């Protein structure tokens, strides 16, 4: 009918005579949102003849219906409810002002690094196709840690580990450093150009033009972090040679000094840089967020730096907060300031690779180091976020690539590695059979699924687009087909 | 304000008590009904003639007819050919009555590796003409009949593909291999080509996700795969070891089969009755043939294709839509055209047989190619009577007519005759910029089909109505695809896609 995806009709009529009602809606998960107007409920023309109105409240998560009249601005009913999808809820307001919100119809219902990379790629492809249009399979509106926020950081962690592993293997093979540097620069340049040309633009609307080309993005950031980490490791590389040896940390001390100074630079630039027409050290979403007194401030210092450097037209025109906070500005999640945190996370992946490689002959030592790093990073994350998605010093935020976000995802990745390394490598109980096929063809699978996003085996016309089940089935089938394609490529040894 | 290849025609009518209407038909139409271009009202008074503006096409020729609106009497007519961006003004006044056309502003318009080189040239020409070729009239497909440069890209590809099947299969058989595995590989390759075509090439996904009710089944790659399968299976079933008319006495079975198929095609085209349509029809319908048969595109071939596949599963914008104003759907890569495509692929197999049987002696190869080209040219001249629209079977791309096959095969034989000594015997030119697509045919074709809209091959234009911009963009895209083919060749990547 007239109900879109995840909406519930709200038939509302007033059993009163001398007040004009305007229903005001505000989703619960928002931190500080101005109550947007929803409908206008007039007075009943005669006694016993209420005037009905139709509303479509978003039922993704919660709702706070606030009602105070236009004439007097005095409350009549403010109630918090959680509507269901495709429901039919009737709000009866009457004298005793009292409201009940009756319900008409019930709403409807080594090998470990490779396995981990395959898991991250499969989840990324799933959430990129839409993830069944579920609110927990899409990027969270500003602060939040939905499932789609857990894919890219793990991929960067895995790439850091693989960078260190391959660098050590090549240096042990005996190749010179200049050839390695040339190769690293070439791969980074290729990744950047691929991201700028093939992945980021959408060519169905029309041809690419400089005035409307999106420079930063996923693959550009991936290549830049690749280049930075690989060059740093190639510069400060030492031959690989326990009981509290602490060699893996003290040997790579220049890397740690550089990473710490980079993190300090990110913290200072975010929390101290004076943004014109915006409070210094802003972390909010702008738009209607923070009670709506900051209309154009999305991203704070990072957003301002990105807009100044690349222009407001070369960024993402539909940021992840544009669906909830109604931000009218453009903000790329893969901006310029977040590259520092991405580099830090890739270096944490390098650290995991160092732990894996140094103590190759003692599994107990590897597990102890992994769990110690996981505990330390988890403690840092808990201290920073104050175990809350809104409060705390630095909230976990994907768009800003917050330091708490990096530390939390590093904790999760270290725990995942602590689980995966024994079973897949040491015990060999389960080789990650359905997963590592993209683990060996990451970049090819990503580029292919971006190019072939719209083709028949991955997309087809559905009976009703306003249904979660059909979208979920289509996305699952597409991801399974990409797993099968990666398997076929692996069998033919096309790397 | 003006479109591309469209002059501006201003009519100044000094007549007093006669409404004036004009008509226009392209000089390239065989029999086209005139269409209303513009209506010029009578002048309210002497000295202030009524002026009306209209845009006239320019791609090729123009014939105008001036008729009275009420009395339906012809006043005057012209055969002037306009310019791309002109300002021609037409004045008609009573003197009998004569109309003079004036120009206000002048227009502004002024292994063997020989098979590999052939296939590379055909592929590059195909990629150029698919991107548009500058929107030129002779770089696009012919309207219904005739032979433009864009019509020669595909038949040469099918010819060389057939020759390559023969060469590769005879090499494999000579080296030693079972026939069952070969037939299985051929079937897999044909099925893969058909599926690739249907899923990737034919449908456009930007307008929306694929819907089964509007899926175009026939197309270039499905036809390629079907003829590949048929000709490869025939030549594999009848394959004798290599050892003077010794290249036909060893091939008479498949020759008889090809003659049977050609006879079947001729019978179906010229004899199969069609409901509400003249038997043995070839005209484009619409306004062609004086508009007596509106929905009769292709005739027998169109009717058979529509009956077997349905109107929804066809090419909705055929080549004749722009000129002959037809509403029905006709797929150029239909079902009856597959017989002639098979015949041309078999002719390519015959050319490969000629090239292989006399590999030692080059004089014999050259005389064989000369004889084949001359015989096919004579057959084409007899069939088409040397005219675009006359003759028994005019050269037709959409129908894949027999004259089309004979003419394009004679041209392919002559091109092979020129290329073979140059690339092999004398070694003057080694196909340096062309044979990399000759090695990566299918990969390059599918890549350019998928990446047609991407930036290096297509970007926003400064002036969308300039031929120069489109030509530069298409040439740059084709050069980039040559470069990509060369890079793939250097990295030893080859025909696996
Ligand atoms: C313009 O007028 C001329 C003459 O009146 C038309 O020529 C004849 O048209 C009738 C029917 O309209 C045909 O039966 C004749 O065969 C035509 N030729 C002759 C010599 O009589 C002409 O058709 C008119 N233009 C258009 C577009 O209809
Ligand atoms: C309520 O609204 C109606 C029209 O919507 C208006 O005529 C009436 O005056 C309003 N009542 C008050 C008290 O403003
Ligand atoms: C409801 O009343 C509060 C004050 O208690 C006010 O801030 C708010 O704007 C009112 N809602 C409206 C006017 O929609
Ligand atoms: C919701 O319930 C009311 C109660 O009768 C009904 O009239 C209305 O049609 C229902 N909504 C829809 C969309 O059917
Ligand atoms: C020419 O067309 C005009 C416009 O309708 C009309 O008034 C006039 O009568 C026409 N001329 C003749 C001779 O009918
Ligand atoms: C054609 O000439 C007329 C009068 O000379 C002028 O008004 C008109 O703009 C010209 N059109 C073009 C396309 O030059």
């Amino acid at each position: 009918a007239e109900l879109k995806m995840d909406q519930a009709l709200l038939l509302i009529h007033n059993e009163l005579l001398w007040t004009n009602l305007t229903v005001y809606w505000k989703s619960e998960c928002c931190y500080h949102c101005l109550f947007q107007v929803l409908v206008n409920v007039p007075q009943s023309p005669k006694a016993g003849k209420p005037s009905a109105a139709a509303a479509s409240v978003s039922t993704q998560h919660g709702s706070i219906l606030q009602l105070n009249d236009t004439l007097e601005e005095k409350e009549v009913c403010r109630l918090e409810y959680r509507f269901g999808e495709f429901g039919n809820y009737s709000l009866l307001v009457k004298n005793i002002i009292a409201c009940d919100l009756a319900v008409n119809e019930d709403p409807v219902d080594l090998r470990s690094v490779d396995t981990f990379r395959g898991i991250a790629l499969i989840l990324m492809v799933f959430v990129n196709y839409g993830g069944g249009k579920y609110w927990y399979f899409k990027h969270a509106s500003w602060n939040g840690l939905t499932v789609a926020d857990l894919v890219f950081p793990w991929f960067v962690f895995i790439m850091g580990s693989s960078i260190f592993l391959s660098m050590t293997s090549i240096l042990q093979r005996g190749c010179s450093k200049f050839r390695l540097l040339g190769k690293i620069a070439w791969r980074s340049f290729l990744l950047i150009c691929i991201g700028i040309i093939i992945v980021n633009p959408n060519y169905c609307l029309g041809p690419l033009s400089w005035d409307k080309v999106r420079i930063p993005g996923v693959l550009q950031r991936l290549g830049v972090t690749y280049f930075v980490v690989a060059v740093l490791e190639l510069l400060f590389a030492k031959p690989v040679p326990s009981c509290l040896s602490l060699r893996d940390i003290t040997s790579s001390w220049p890397q740690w000094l550089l990473i710490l100074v980079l993190e300090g630079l990110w913290l200072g630039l975010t929390f101290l840089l004076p943004v014109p027409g915006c409070p210094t050290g802003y972390l909010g979403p702008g738009g209607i967020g923070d009670f709506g007194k900051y209309p154009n401030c999305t991203g704070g210092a990072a957003g301002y730096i990105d807009r100044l450097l690349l222009g407001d037209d070369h960024l993402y025109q539909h940021p992840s907060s544009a669906v909830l906070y109604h931000t009218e500005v453009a903000y790329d999640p893969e901006g310029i300031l977040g590259t520092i945190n991405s580099i830090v996370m890739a270096f944490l992946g390098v650290q995991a690779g160092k732990i894996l490689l140094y103590y190759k002959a003692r599994t107990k030592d590897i597990l102890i180091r992994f769990t110690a790093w996981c505990c330390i990073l988890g403690l840092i994350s808990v201290a920073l976020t104050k175990v809350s998605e809104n409060e705390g010093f630095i909230p976990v935020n994907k768009n800003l690539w917050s330091l708490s976000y990096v530390t939390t995802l590093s904790s999760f990745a270290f725990f995942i590695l602590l689980v995966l390394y024994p079973v897949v490598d040491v015990k060999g109980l389960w080789t990650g059979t359905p997963f590592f096929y993209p683990g060996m063809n990451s970049i090819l699978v990503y580029v292919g699924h971006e190019v072939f996003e719209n083709y028949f085996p991955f997309q087809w016309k559905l009976k009703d687009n306003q249904s979660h089940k059909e979208h979920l089935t289509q996305n699952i089938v597409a991801t399974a087909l990409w797993v099968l394609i990666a398997y076929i490529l692996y069998r033919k040894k096309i790397f």
Side-chain angles (χ1 to χ4, degrees), chain A residues 1 3-14 16-45 47-48 50-70 73 75-93 95-108 110-172 174-178 180-182 184-210 213-237 239-242 245-246 248-311 313-327 329-361 363 365-385 387-388 390 392-462 464-468 470-495:
Chain A
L3 287 164
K4 308 299 192 334
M5 187 165 20
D6 277 345
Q7 284 188 359
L9 276 197
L10 188 83
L11 264 276
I12 50 179
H13 39 280
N14 67 90
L16 45 85
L17 328 182
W18 314 118
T19 55
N20 275 320
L21 299 197
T22 45
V23 166
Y24 274 100
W25 172 66
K26 187 255 283 187
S27 182
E28 168 277 338
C29 86
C30 168
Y31 190 44
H32 297 325
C33 277
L34 286 193
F35 275 87
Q36 310 95 306
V37 73
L38 186 69
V39 295
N40 307 323
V41 173
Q43 323 185 144
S44 64
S51 159
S56 281
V57 286
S58 180
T59 172
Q60 283 184 353
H61 36 267
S63 289
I64 302 176
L65 289 186
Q66 173 145 38
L67 326 181
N68 40 8
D69 73 311
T70 306
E73 270 69 34
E75 319 315 316
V76 291
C77 260
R78 156 141 182 260
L79 84 170
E80 170 146 9
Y81 204 70
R82 189 173 213 288
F83 298 101
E85 38 196 349
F86 298 132
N88 190 359
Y89 301 79
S90 66
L91 182 48
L92 227 59
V93 282
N95 294 115
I96 191 166
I97 317 287
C99 56
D100 55 356
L101 198 135
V103 184
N104 280 341
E105 300 194 346
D106 212 7
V108 301
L110 186 46
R111 284 317 290 290
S112 182
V113 184
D114 284 331
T115 307
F116 190 36
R117 177 182 289 166
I119 281 185
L121 277 153
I122 290 323
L123 263 73
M124 167 161 341
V125 164
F126 188 20
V127 304
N128 202 2
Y129 280 165
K133 293 313 188 41
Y134 288 112
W135 67 267
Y136 37 85
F137 278 134
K138 279 206 285 278
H139 312 287
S141 293
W142 216 243
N143 302 345
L145 202 60
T146 61
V147 179
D149 274 9
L150 308 170
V151 284
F152 200 42
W154 285 348
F155 194 30
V156 170
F157 194 76
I158 290 145
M159 156 188 304
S161 292
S162 297
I163 287 284
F164 172 69
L165 262 293
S166 164
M167 222 57 27
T168 289
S169 165
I170 285 168
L171 280 187
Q172 181 150 337
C175 275
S176 174
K177 289 189 173 177
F178 290 130
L180 261 180
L181 200 145
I184 288 302
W186 176 243
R187 324 211 191 170
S188 301
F189 187 109
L190 193 86
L191 283 190
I192 282 166
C193 280
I194 285 168
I196 287 176
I197 281 170
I198 284 167
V199 163
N200 283 119
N202 187 14
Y203 295 99
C204 279
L205 318 87
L208 187 78
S209 61
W210 190 308
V213 62
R214 187 201 157 193
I215 285 184
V218 161
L219 276 183
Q220 301 88 341
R221 172 197 277 286
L222 203 65
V224 162
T225 55
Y226 179 101
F227 172 77
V228 169
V229 165
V231 164
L232 190 43
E233 174 47 40
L234 183 56
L235 257 53
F236 300 109
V240 51
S242 76
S245 80
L246 281 174
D248 71 272
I249 303 183
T250 188
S251 199
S252 65
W253 73 274
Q255 275 105 351
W256 271 120
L257 183 53
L258 194 43
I259 289 302
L260 286 181
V261 83
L262 282 177
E263 198 54 38
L265 163 69
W266 179 92
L267 268 182
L269 264 178
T270 285
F271 283 89
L272 269 306
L273 189 81
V275 183
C278 204
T280 76
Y282 192 57
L283 297 170
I288 60 188
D290 289 327
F291 289 123
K293 44 179 76 146
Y294 305 126
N296 306 341
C297 269
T298 293
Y304 154 73
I305 284 174
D306 180 28
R307 260 182 302 281
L308 160 77
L309 277 184
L310 287 159
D313 213 291
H314 287 252
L315 319 175
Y316 214 80
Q317 293 305 302
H318 331 119
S320 55
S321 59
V323 75
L324 189 67
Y325 293 98
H326 292 114
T327 72
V329 293
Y331 181 36
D332 230 14
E334 315 89 298
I336 301 309
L337 217 57
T339 300
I340 307 178
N341 276 319
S342 194
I343 286 160
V344 161
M345 161 95 77
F347 175 72
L348 278 191
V350 168
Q351 199 41 248
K354 277 216 198 80
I355 273 174
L356 197 173
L357 210 43
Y358 272 20
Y359 321 110
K360 202 79 156 210
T363 295
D365 294 345
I366 279 182
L367 296 188
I368 285 295
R369 304 281 210 300
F370 272 167
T371 188
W373 271 91
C374 176
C375 196
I376 286 311
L377 293 174
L379 285 199
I380 295 296
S381 283
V382 167
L384 278 183
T385 71
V387 67
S388 187
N390 314 335
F393 195 26
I394 311 184
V396 162
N397 176 337
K398 187 256 184 181
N399 281 257
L400 289 165
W401 264 78
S402 293
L403 170 65
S404 85
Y405 179 74
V406 167
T407 51
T408 304
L409 266 282
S410 310
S411 303
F412 286 178
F414 264 107
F415 178 66
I416 288 298
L417 262 181
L418 156 71
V419 152
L420 281 193
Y421 181 58
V423 287
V424 180
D425 225 350
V426 171
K427 281 303 301 170
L429 297 168
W430 155 70
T431 62
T433 44
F435 284 132
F436 62 82
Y437 307 137
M440 321 285 257
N441 292 296
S442 60
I443 177 61
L444 198 148
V445 160
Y446 189 83
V447 172
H449 98 275
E450 272 294 346
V451 170
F452 295 155
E453 171 149 321
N454 300 115
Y455 285 10
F456 154 75
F458 319 101
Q459 306 269 119
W460 61 84
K461 188 178 288 293
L462 319 171
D464 42 351
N465 315 72
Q466 281 74 241
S467 43
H468 284 332
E470 209 70 23
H471 286 283
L472 179 63
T473 295
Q474 165 186 315
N475 297 141
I476 281 181
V477 167
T479 294
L481 282 184
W482 264 117
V483 174
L484 184 54
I485 286 174
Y487 181 29
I488 292 302
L489 295 193
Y490 166 70
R491 279 285 300 280
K492 285 160 45 205
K493 304 169 186 55
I494 302 193
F495 285 173

